[model samples]
Target: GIILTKVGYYTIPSMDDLAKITNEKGECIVSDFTIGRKGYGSIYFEGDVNLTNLNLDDIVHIRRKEVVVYLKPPVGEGLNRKAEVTLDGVWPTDKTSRCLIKSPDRLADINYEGRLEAVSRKQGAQFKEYRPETGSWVFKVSHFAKYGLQD
Candidate 1:
């Protein structure tokens, strides 16, 4: 439960082919290239996702400028799965910090860089690890529903 900070969330888009392996453990990986306003960003969901009753055909729109990481089933005592969200996009990189690219401590980096956040949803958004080499933001999720990066 490293996600204690609180930022709210909007809908975020989904893909039909997301987890299109048709829901298998260790194989629920997917990616989206048309996320954000100009479709200038991409998000990768790693092999830790469990997509059961989660549908990927919904369209979540926001009038703002941040990327929304909206998954599903954050209800009914919660979901028992996790996933890694890797994003390297123009907007996602526009705000991540690089001071801790070589460091390990989070707060020092949080204080010295990023200023990016991880939000847990009661409907919220949170944090991500930044990649300076390619301007990507890496975030780990033990829980889902809604989350994403912002400065």
Candidate 2:
């Protein structure tokens, strides 16, 4: 577990759709965008994200300026399944840091409300890893209820 000084997230919008999201200044926060079926997208920016760059949407929302990375069930877990990570509502430019583009590192202070399926296997319940030595982070399925939100 590598110590993270700060943890945040960004939006993928859609895989093949172009959605226009603006800020308080009415500046297009998202432009010419595309994401994968798995929400793979990227943004190029450098500086303190003015806090207005982020916009609300059907699935995700920003409460008090802190971006929430919400994941639910199948879509939120499994191999090649993850959400985008960012700093100050913007992506990092350093190519070396580009790997940070996607992750499932649930921020300790942020809000995470959803169900995770915990399968007892290599990629099972509550099993998460961050291989900084190999410069990689692996996603897994964990803690999901079968009947309802509660056991």
Candidate 3:
């Protein structure tokens, strides 16, 4: 599930807070190739502001053009697979970005594309993915900001 929020000095958002507007509408399949791997799934972000009445332009700001993301393997998978998963199509081709997907494990070299759908001062947007064979996947987005915040 994806939740969009506006971060402010007076307020902080917890996982439960963001989960309010959650969209848990996706799925993935575990396979022989994906054994012991964390699954992958995707959700499109559009018109997320309509879900709430907080006019984004009034209080918060977002640096949509400078947004970036990083993905890595979970804790115990470090030596087994360092940077084994790949995320593609996750950003706009026109944006500045970087990705590291090197891995020691041969089968752990996996890649998937994430698409940036729509974003504006009024509406925040994004796309997320999950796939079975990608090992344990960890994700983080840089520069998605109250100056707030997805797919």
Candidate 4:
């Protein structure tokens, strides 16, 4: 009874839009990967933005940096256990993750480093920290699917 999937992201662009669109269309800059949860996740920018001179203090002093690459799950698929899955049922760590509410054939791969306690009326149980640039991890996640997923 676990199929609350997340880690599906695409078009996560930053780092100055990957060197200004790979040096104005030379094409050779890529940094995006996602296979399990869904699909379409990208973000790779280099730097230097003049934009033919449109100075609002150079657009508030253009500065950007992004480096987050995590793509590992294709060797059988989800939650290949060495034994470890506890959350409030206890506290353990072997990177636990197991889900199949609607069934993606099967999936469970988790290694939680603390977090899952949520309670907020105006910020009560607090600990809500996840921002893929306001996509908010695509609204938690479920089985309806929305950006990527076929098999």
**87-115, model 2: which lDDT tens digit per residue?**
12211123565443322343211212122
Q: Which runs in model 2 stand beyond 4 Å of their true positions?
A: 1-56, 63-65, 75-80, 89-151
- Give the candidates in order of TM-score, highest first: 1, 2, 4, 3
lDDT (Cα, tens digit) per residue for candidate 3, span 70-132: 112243221112111223222212123443333324222322222212222232322323332
| Residue 52 C-alpha lDDT in model 4 | 28
RMSD of 3: 17.2
Q: State each model's CA lDDT, in order.
A: 0.37, 0.27, 0.25, 0.23
Deviation of model 2 at 133, angstroms: 27
Off by over 4 Å in 1: 1-54, 59-71, 74-80, 90-113, 117-128
Residue runs of model 4 more than 4 Å from their true location after superposition: 1-11, 14-16, 21-99, 102-115, 118-126, 129-151
Model 2 TM-score relative to the real fold:
0.20
Model 2 lDDT, residue 47, Cα: 23
In model 3, the runs with Cα more than 4 Å from the true position are 1-38, 41-104, 108-134, 144-151
* TM-score of candidate 4 to 2 decimals: 0.16
Give the winner by TM-score: 2 or 4.
Answer: 2
Error of 3 at 108 (Å): 6.3
The C-alpha TM-scores of every prediction are 0.37, 0.20, 0.15, 0.16
lDDT of 4: 0.23
* Cα RMSD (angstroms) for every candidate in the order listed: 11.0, 16.0, 17.2, 18.4
